[PDB]
Amino acid sequence: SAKSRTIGIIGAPFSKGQPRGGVEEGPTVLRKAGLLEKLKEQECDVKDYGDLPFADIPNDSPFQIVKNPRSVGKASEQLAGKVAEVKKNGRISLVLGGDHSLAIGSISGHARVHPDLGVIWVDAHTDINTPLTTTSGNLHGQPVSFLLKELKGKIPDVPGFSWVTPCISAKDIVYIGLRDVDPGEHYILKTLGIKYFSMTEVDRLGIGKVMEETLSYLLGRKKRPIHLSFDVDGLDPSFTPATGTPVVGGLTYREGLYITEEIYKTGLLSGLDIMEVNPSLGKTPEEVTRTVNTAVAITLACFGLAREGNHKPIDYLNP
Amino acid sequence: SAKSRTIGIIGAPFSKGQPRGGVEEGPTVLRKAGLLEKLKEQECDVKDYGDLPFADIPNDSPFQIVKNPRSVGKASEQLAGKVAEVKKNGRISLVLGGDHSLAIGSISGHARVHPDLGVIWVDAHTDINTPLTTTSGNLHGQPVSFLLKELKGKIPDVPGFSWVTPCISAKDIVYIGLRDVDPGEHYILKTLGIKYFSMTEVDRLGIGKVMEETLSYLLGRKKRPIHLSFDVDGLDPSFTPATGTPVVGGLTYREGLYITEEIYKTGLLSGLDIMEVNPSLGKTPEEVTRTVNTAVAITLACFGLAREGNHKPIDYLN
Amino acid sequence: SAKSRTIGIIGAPFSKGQPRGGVEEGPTVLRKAGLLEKLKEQECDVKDYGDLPFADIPNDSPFQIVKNPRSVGKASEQLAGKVAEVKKNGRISLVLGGDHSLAIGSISGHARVHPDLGVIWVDAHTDINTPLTTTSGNLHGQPVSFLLKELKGKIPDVPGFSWVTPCISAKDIVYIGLRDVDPGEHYILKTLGIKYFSMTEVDRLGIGKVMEETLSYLLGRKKRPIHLSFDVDGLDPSFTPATGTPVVGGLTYREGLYITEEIYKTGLLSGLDIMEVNPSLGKTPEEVTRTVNTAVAITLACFGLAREGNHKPIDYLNP
Ligand SMILES: [NH3+][C@@]1(C(=O)O)C[C@]2(CC[NH2+]C2)C[C@@H]1CCC[B-](O)(O)O
Ligand SMILES: [NH3+][C@@]1(C(=O)O)C[C@]2(CC[NH2+]C2)C[C@@H]1CCC[B-](O)(O)O
Ligand SMILES: [NH3+][C@@]1(C(=O)O)C[C@]2(CC[NH2+]C2)C[C@@H]1CCC[B-](O)(O)O
Ligand SMILES: [Mn+2]
Ligand SMILES: [Mn+2]
Ligand SMILES: [Mn+2]
Ligand SMILES: [Mn+2]
Ligand SMILES: [Mn+2]
Ligand SMILES: [Mn+2]
Numbered sequence: 001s002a003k004s005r006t007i008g009i010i011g012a013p014f015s016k017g018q019p020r021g022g023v024e025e026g027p028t029v030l031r032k033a034g035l036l037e038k039l040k041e042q043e044c045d046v047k048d049y050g051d052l053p054f055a056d057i058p059n060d061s062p063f064q065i066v067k068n069p070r071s072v073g074k075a076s077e078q079l080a081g082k083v084a085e086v087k088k089n090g091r092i093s094l095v096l097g098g099d100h101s102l103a104i105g106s107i108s109g110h111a112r113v114h115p116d117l118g119v120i121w122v123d124a125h126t127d128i129n130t131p132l133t134t135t136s137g138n139l140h141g142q143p144v145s146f147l148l149k150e151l152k153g154k155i156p157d158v159p160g161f162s163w164v165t166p167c168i169s170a171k172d173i174v175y176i177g178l179r180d181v182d183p184g185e186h187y188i189l190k191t192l193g194i195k196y197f198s199m200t201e202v203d204r205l206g207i208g209k210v211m212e213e214t215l216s217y218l219l220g221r222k223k224r225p226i227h228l229s230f231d232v233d234g235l236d237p238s239f240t241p242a243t244g245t246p247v248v249g250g251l252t253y254r255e256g257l258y259i260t261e262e263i264y265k266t267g268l269l270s271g272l273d274i275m276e277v278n279p280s281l282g283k284t285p286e287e288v289t290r291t292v293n294t295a296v297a298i299t300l301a302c303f304g305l306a307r308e309g310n311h312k313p314i315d316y317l318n319p
Numbered sequence: 320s321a322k323s324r325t326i327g328i329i330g331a332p333f334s335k336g337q338p339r340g341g342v343e344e345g346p347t348v349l350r351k352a353g354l355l356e357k358l359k360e361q362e363c364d365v366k367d368y369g370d371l372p373f374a375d376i377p378n379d380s381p382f383q384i385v386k387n388p389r390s391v392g393k394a395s396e397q398l399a400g401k402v403a404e405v406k407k408n409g410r411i412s413l414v415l416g417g418d419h420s421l422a423i424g425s426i427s428g429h430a431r432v433h434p435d436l437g438v439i440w441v442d443a444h445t446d447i448n449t450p451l452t453t454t455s456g457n458l459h460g461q462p463v464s465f466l467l468k469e470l471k472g473k474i475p476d477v478p479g480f481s482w483v484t485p486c487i488s489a490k491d492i493v494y495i496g497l498r499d500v501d502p503g504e505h506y507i508l509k510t511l512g513i514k515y516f517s518m519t520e521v522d523r524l525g526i527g528k529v530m531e532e533t534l535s536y537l538l539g540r541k542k543r544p545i546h547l548s549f550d551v552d553g554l555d556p557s558f559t560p561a562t563g564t565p566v567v568g569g570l571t572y573r574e575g576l577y578i579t580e581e582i583y584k585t586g587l588l589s590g591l592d593i594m595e596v597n598p599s600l601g602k603t604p605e606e607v608t609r610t611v612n613t614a615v616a617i618t619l620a621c622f623g624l625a626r627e628g629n630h631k632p633i634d635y636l637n
Numbered sequence: 638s639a640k641s642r643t644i645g646i647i648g649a650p651f652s653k654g655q656p657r658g659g660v661e662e663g664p665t666v667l668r669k670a671g672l673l674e675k676l677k678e679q680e681c682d683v684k685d686y687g688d689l690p691f692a693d694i695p696n697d698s699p700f701q702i703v704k705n706p707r708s709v710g711k712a713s714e715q716l717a718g719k720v721a722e723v724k725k726n727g728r729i730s731l732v733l734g735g736d737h738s739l740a741i742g743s744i745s746g747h748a749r750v751h752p753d754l755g756v757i758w759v760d761a762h763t764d765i766n767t768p769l770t771t772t773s774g775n776l777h778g779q780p781v782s783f784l785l786k787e788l789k790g791k792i793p794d795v796p797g798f799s800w801v802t803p804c805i806s807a808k809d810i811v812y813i814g815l816r817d818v819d820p821g822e823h824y825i826l827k828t829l830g831i832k833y834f835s836m837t838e839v840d841r842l843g844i845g846k847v848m849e850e851t852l853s854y855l856l857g858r859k860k861r862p863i864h865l866s867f868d869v870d871g872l873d874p875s876f877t878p879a880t881g882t883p884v885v886g887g888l889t890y891r892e893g894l895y896i897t898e899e900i901y902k903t904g905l906l907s908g909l910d911i912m913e914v915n916p917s918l919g920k921t922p923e924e925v926t927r928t929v930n931t932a933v934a935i936t937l938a939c940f941g942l943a944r945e946g947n948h949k950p951i952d953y954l955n956p
Pocket of ligand 6: 419442444446459550595
């Protein structure tokens with residue numbers, strides 16, 4: 001199959017980045033929904049590397065207020081190794097989460113094989129809090145801080161993160177869907193001059209202009225791999241309610257599909273994260289099914305499924 | 320009343336273009352909602368040509384996988400005759416469906432009186448499958464194939480369709496709202512070079528640019544008649560749930576009203592189809608009422624009802 | 638605090654401008670939701686002038702079809718005096734309604750201190766019916782007609798309104814969100830040549846272009862105080878269902894936040910009305926809260942709360 005439709009699926013059943021149980025069932029519910037089968041139906045070369053075990057770390061005291069540092073640290077270190085293995089096999093790494101702290105490992109591992117990569121971060125949250133700016137202490141709101149080169153000297157020695165080396169510069173990341181940012185995070189976002197399209201920008205410009213600007217900002221100088229880190233809470237909770245930190249006034253089902261359709265069209269998608277699907281956080285069994293279906297739809301669009309339609313290079317009027 | 324406000328209403332209680340029962344009740348639920356009365360309230364000259372009787376064809380064997388060919392063929396043939404009669408009487412034909420296979424008859428009947436007409440097709444689906452590309456065999460998903468001049472020779476001899484003559488060229492149709500297109504249909508669109516605004520285009524451009532481009536593509540050379548074929552599943556199932564083939568991520572209530580408001584403003588609406596309203600597919604009685612109300616609102620906008628407001632040519636302050 | 642964040646709160650528990658009971662509980666439910674506390678949390682200087690006592694007028698006969706004229710007349714006369722007092726104290730007047738007839742008093746009282754003010758009217762309705770064009774006889778659908786200078790000679794001697802002097806010209810008002818306009822109102826709108834962005838315009842242009850044009854139309858010549866009169870039914874009933882006259886196809890939660898965010902950014906907000914919140918019209922206990930939370934969110938955006946985030950002028954990376 002073509003490069004843009006060759007896929008290495010990694011299940012990352014991990015939850016200790018945040019306090020709500022159930023996010024570790026994300027790989028299980030996404031698979032049961034028939035993700036692998038639906039991708040193979042759209043001419044994809046899919047290989048399943050299974051679910052990473054993430055063996056228990058019973059002795060994992062907090063670093064100041066930062067909860068489960070060694071667990072989050074080790075899960076991300078093993079994900080890095082697995083993502084790098086998938087990348088070396090000439091496959092787009094498809095990380096099924098799991099909480100967004102796993103992005104430390106996903107982007108790090110991807111950058112080991114492709115150091116020139118650019119990040120598109122779809123989320124309601126910046127996840128750029130450092131272990132010292134965080135007020136919650138939940139590492140799922142800190143991944144970007146461990147990855148940025150400009151934040152070196154501002155990240156303290158956190159147990160389980162000594163393997164981490166900042167791999168991305170402030171200029172190679174674009175945020176889309178922002179609407180819930182902490183004071184410390186907003187300060188980081190402005191002082192470093194990170195490119196962002198909050199909900200305000202999406203409202204002002206329209207998702208067409210947002211995507212046109214996002215892709216020109218990151219690819220204008222030179223074509224390079226794209227790493228899309230998709231947090232389902234980035235979409236409005238009317239489409240993805242079964243998630244840990246939902247915020248009203250989010251990206252629509254259409255905007256979510258438009259972002260992913262545009263990234264596919266570049267033929268440069270190299271890494272993908274489908275994060276924060278928590279099937280225990282539905283209010284009804286339908287809310288869970290609605291979130292999973294939306295997450296599956298976003299994923300299919302990342303690998304070629306277009307609303308206008310798709311067809312094989314054959315004559316349909318004379319079979 | 321003005322030409323843009325003179326209507327000939329045709330009831331088309333037909334369902335055999337698809338397998339789900341209840342879509343034949345569409346003319347009944349749209350009328351009960353007070354469509355005729357509400358149109359007369361907005362200074363429309365309304366003439367009701369009634370509901371067409373669709374006689375049973377008991378031995379209507381399938382053409383390959385294509386279900387009920389003679390039934391779908393005869394219903395359209397009847398609709399074509401009625402639409403032409405309405406058009407000759409200087410009226411805008413308002414077809415109350417019924418499934419989308421009735422578009423074969425609606426557009427054919429309209430083209431007999433106005434051959435230079437342009438088609439605006441609002442829908443989640445292209446309905447351009449031919450009897451040979453179709454996988455479902457449901458005729459409601461093949462009306463455009465029978466109408467296109469470029470597909471002459473690609474349509475086999477289907478029982479009940481020998482009266483059909485392709486009346487529209489690939490350059491005379493614009494699609495709005497596409498989000499569920501079959502491989503064969505996508506091939507047809509691309510090879511014939513049909514103009515389309517799928518949900519991707521609506522997201523990219525905005526409905527303002529979509530309409531500006533749709534109307535310029537069609538009338539740019541000179542003014543010509545407009546046939547709007549409105550399938551309620553073109554709109555999102557949060558506004559029109561009571562329909563046979565609903566697809567998520569659809570046109571909003573606002574986008575639907577914006578398309579119809581822009582078409583009204585041209586004063587060139589000559590034919591209208593309000594299709595696929597199925598009152599048996601509402602999960603609650605409210606889902607049915609919501610779909611009917613949305614369909615009625617779309618129809619009123621086609622004949623002048625504007626969100627900014629409307630007023631009679633009199634002095635309201637004196 | 639900053640002028641744009643120095644606020645004076647006025648409670649206006651009044652309902653006799655329409656026939657549905659409960660809209661007088663609007664100030665009570667908005668306060669209970671913690672509006673004052675949330676504003677002080679975003680560095681606002683908040684002063685509460687309390688709830689205006691609206692004494693009963695037992696012998697209130699209708700003027701033709703116009704219901705409760707003296708009651709509506711006296712309530713706005715009382716509000717005008719209070720708004721003017723708040724304005725003289727160098728504060729942004731924040732009127733918590735209450736039905737939209739109170740806009741007669743809110744805009745009048747504001748114009749006594751700032752006569753060059755511009756009005757942004759966020760609503761589904763024009764509220765421009767005169768006491769003679771109205772078919773309902775409900776004064777909350779008439780405040781604009783009492784305020785316009787061009788409609789002087791067309792407003793009859795209505796009991797309780799002799800204190801009223803038209804303070805705004807047709808060129809000084811912009812409508813946003815219109816979708817339910819009476820024939821008489823549409824005639825007034827067109828004959829006077831009032832600037833408006835009905836839902837048709839919002840769909841055509843996008844809220845970005847709508848706001849850019851609204852602010853340019855009013856502030857292009859000279860900076861002037863902005864009076865935002867926000868009726869919650871201007872937003873779609875999926876966000877504000879607990880309201881008297883809901884109309885489908887309204888402004889989204891995002892569009893509402895975008896309008897208010899843009900008005901804040903000018904630093905020229907001088908008067909604000911949060912009207913038609915009726916907690917008795919919520920089909921479930923959930924519908925009231927949704928409407929209330931939405932109204933509180935709109936208000937916070939008017940005084941600085943931004944979706945991209947906010948931060949204090951301190952170095953967060955080096956405390
Ligand atoms: N910035 C947060 C954090 O934990 O740092 C604050 C938060 C808790 C209270 N208000 C929202 C959650 C947010 C982190 C979001 C992490 B996510 O992976 O879902 O983007
Ligand atoms: N192209 C379809 C067909 O029946 O040909 C296939 C369909 C069934 C399963 N996938 C979508 C329905 C579609 C026909 C749509 C007809 B309609 O009037 O609703 O637009
Ligand atoms: N123009 C109205 C009026 O009473 O003037 C007519 C109305 C009643 C039935 N149809 C809509 C209500 C509208 C006025 C609404 C007042 B409001 O402040 O909520 O806009
Ligand atoms: Mn996240
Ligand atoms: Mn998030
Ligand atoms: Mn159709
Ligand atoms: Mn359809
Ligand atoms: Mn109002
Ligand atoms: Mn209103």
